[PDB]
């Protein structure tokens, strides 16, 4: 339940992005389901959970992605698990996507009319997401980076290495995966990827800006 | 074991499951300076695309500034009175591969001149071709904004691990939030813009149990 400050900082300091995986070490089914749960339990704006997790274990599909996946060229051949996270397309307040969102919350008829009003104000005016489809997509995509973070941190807490991945051609990745029937490309598009496994070598800790530079205190 | 505590599967899940979005804070319970520093470090230490760390954390403790945000901050109107700490995360505007921002990124990594040139080529391909972030100013800002949701996520989890309640916040008027904070002189409006906020403190009331889509619904296994 509760950690000390030391335990929290040892966790976040020791987690590095791992590019060199031991191809002979596999994550147990039990450990990998725990990582997926960390993603599933993530918070999201208005409880939208606008994500899907493709676990790409197929070695033939891993090979096919390599030519346009320069960010994980080595990792695709050596990592235990690969997750491609999709974000919901056209998640408009007035879409059936939000019928499901409200159902899950158990809102009555009048509670739903109020919720639709709130969702519209958020999307149209407050955040101005309804400028174009890409701006609305990028909103769900941001939610999926919460899921990404939780999966990275959870894996690290279990003693499992990981790497978040943006280093691929998104258009060709979208075509590649949609052509495999892995999702409806009218409903979802690729957001971000992540590899999981066990380092093949020591991974040097990487630099950060100072807390003084990152934080502006407004007392 | 080692210098590091090794958590069980059950303890790791506990940490994510026990984190609920808190809207009702005890106004008499304040987060210690030390615990809140820890929370901020979880944000600082977050991963980011190409080590860009394109975030800035405004810690808004000023009660006059908090009350000024209320009229256009309907998603945390009551939290603004009762929460211990408030963090507004900015994302870098116009983080182009050729920008002074990326000179600083490469300077932190200790790249010599030849491997700076190779990094520039990588940044350029990612922004221009792979992710097509240079469509307009907003697509480029939204890429930095996505990095800041990792920092957000890790600060909620850090708070959770320390026994501290939190709420991620999007429920405010962004143009008005930007105007309010920039007119206060808290950042350069051409350099940064508001990405997302979060409240921190202690529950005054028992908060709702999780409602999520099943693992069956969200996971497609490709064996
Ligand atoms: C959204 C995201 C995408 C990333 N994409 C890649 C990638 O494609 N290839 C890679 O080798 N590292 C990738 N990284 C890892 C970052 O380079 C890394 O987080 C950064 O260099 C800081 O190092 P550290 O995470 O080990 O502390 C990515 C990180 C993030 C957050
Ligand atoms: C980016 C983001 C913004 C959110 N903004 C608000 C907010 O403005 N007000 C609020 O009460 N909750 C807000 N939430 C909390 C969500 O409603 C909550 O995460 C979701 O309903 C799931 O509930 P849980 O976090 O308690 O599991 C936000 C969540 C996220 C991830
Ligand atoms: Ca220790
Ligand atoms: Cl690689
Ligand atoms: Cl509130
Ligand atoms: K969307
Ligand atoms: K930017």
Residue numbers in the entry:
A (entry chain A): 2 to 220
B (entry chain B): -2 to 220
Please quote the authors directly.
Phylogenetically diverse bacteria can carry out chloramphenicol reduction, but only a single enzyme has been described that efficiently catalyzes this reaction, the NfsB nitroreductase from Haemophilus influenzae strain KW20. We found that expression of H. influenzae and Neisseria spp. nfsB genes, but not Pasteurella multocida nfsB, allows Escherichia coli to resist chloramphenicol by nitroreduction. Mass spectrometric analysis confirmed that purified H. influenzae and N. meningitides NfsB enzymes reduce chloramphenicol to amino-chloramphenicol, while kinetics analyses supported the hypothesis that chloramphenicol reduction is a secondary activity. Previous kinetic studies of nitroreductase catalysis revealed that reactions progress by a double-displacement (ping-pong) mechanism that appears to lack the gating steps necessary to impose specificity, explaining the substrate promiscuity of these enzymes.
To understand better how variation in the substrate-binding site mediates activity, we solved the crystal structures of the NfsB homologs from Hi KW20, Hi Int1, Hi 86-028NP, and Nm Z2491. The Hi Int1 and Hi 86-028NP enzymes showed comparable, although statistically significant, kinetics (q < 0.05) to Hi KW20 NfsB. In contrast to the reduction of chloramphenicol, the oxidation of NADPH showed less apparent variability in catalytic efficiency, with only Hi 86-028NP NfsB showing significantly greater activity than Hi KW20 NfsB (∼1.7-fold, q < 0.005). The relative increase in resistance conferred by H. influenzae or Neisseria nfsB expression ranged from approximately a 16-fold increase (Hi KW20 and Hi 86-028NP) down to an ∼2-fold increase (Hi Int1 and Hi 12). Intuitively, the Ser68-Met74 pair found in Hi 12 NfsB would provide more of the flexibility needed to properly locate and orient Trp71 to make space for the ribose of NADP than the Pro68-Ile74 pair in other H. influenzae NfsB homologs (Pro68-Ala74 in Nm Z2491 NfsB).
